[PDB]
Amino acid sequence: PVYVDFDVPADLEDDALEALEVARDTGAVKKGTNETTKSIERGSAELVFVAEDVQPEEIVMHIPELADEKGVPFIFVEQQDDLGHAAGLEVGSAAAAVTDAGAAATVLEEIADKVEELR
Template identity: 75%
Template sequence: MSVYVTYDVPADLEDDAIEALEVARDTGTVKKGTNETTKAVERGNASLVYIAEDVSPEEIVMHLPELADEKEIPFVFVETQDDVGHAAGLEVGSAAAAIVDAGDADEDVEDITTTVEDLR
């Protein structure tokens, strides 16, 4: 487990989170990549942040959990960058992503947020 991963995410929660990201990508607004995700969190626009667990070097995303906590934005860890990237609509992996407008995934994002808060 990476240094920045602060809690274990059950496989079913990770699957639900990936599914919500895919729905939000198609019906809402999603930010892709560490820089766009960081900006969305800093501006308070993100409703859910995704952080890949296999990022190397770890410093690329190490700031995100702390920043998201500071802005009171929930975040979920996903096993691989490929999972995050593909769910966000990219053909390559992505170290991070954020849902800005959940679109049809609104209820799913709320459920995931509640579950994440319980896990932490």
Template identity: 45%
Template sequence: MAEYVKFSVGKELKEKQFELIEKVTKTGKIRIGVNETTKAIERGKAKIIFIAEDVSPQELVMHLPLLCEEKKIPYSFISTKKELGEKAGIAVGTASIALIEEGSAKKEL
């Protein structure tokens, strides 16, 4: 487990996270990538953050959990950048995403 990963996510929760990300991608708004995620957190627009566990170098995302805790924004981890990118609807992996507007997933958040 990477140094910045503070907890592991069980299989059942991981599936619910994937459903949430896919639903928000289709009906809400997300920000993709470390820079966009960081801006969304700092501006107070992020509802929840997802961070890939396999980011290298780790320093790219090490600040995100700390920033989320400071701003009281929930965050979680996804196993790989590839999985996170796929669920966010892009053809490449991404280190992080921020859910900005819930869309039809409002009840699930």
């Protein structure tokens, strides 16, 4: 909400999650806000996901601007439990980072484009 400056259409979010699932199987992904933050800082992040139902918002507030000054692309997901399930967790996840996609580097790279265009 305060850290969300653009709305991601339902369909875009699905493509994103889908890509994330093939990422945990084919490539590499980081689950959890602390491990995600470190990707963006270490530059190893290619696409970071951030839930929008995070309370307190403090936990994720920094992702956006941090991602911006690091060139890393990011996309918002409405449900926290969807991101966690997509990432492969039995629990939810406030943030995730596809650390080097897998059999999705295409669809992925394009999701990053659609979002950059989503302003």
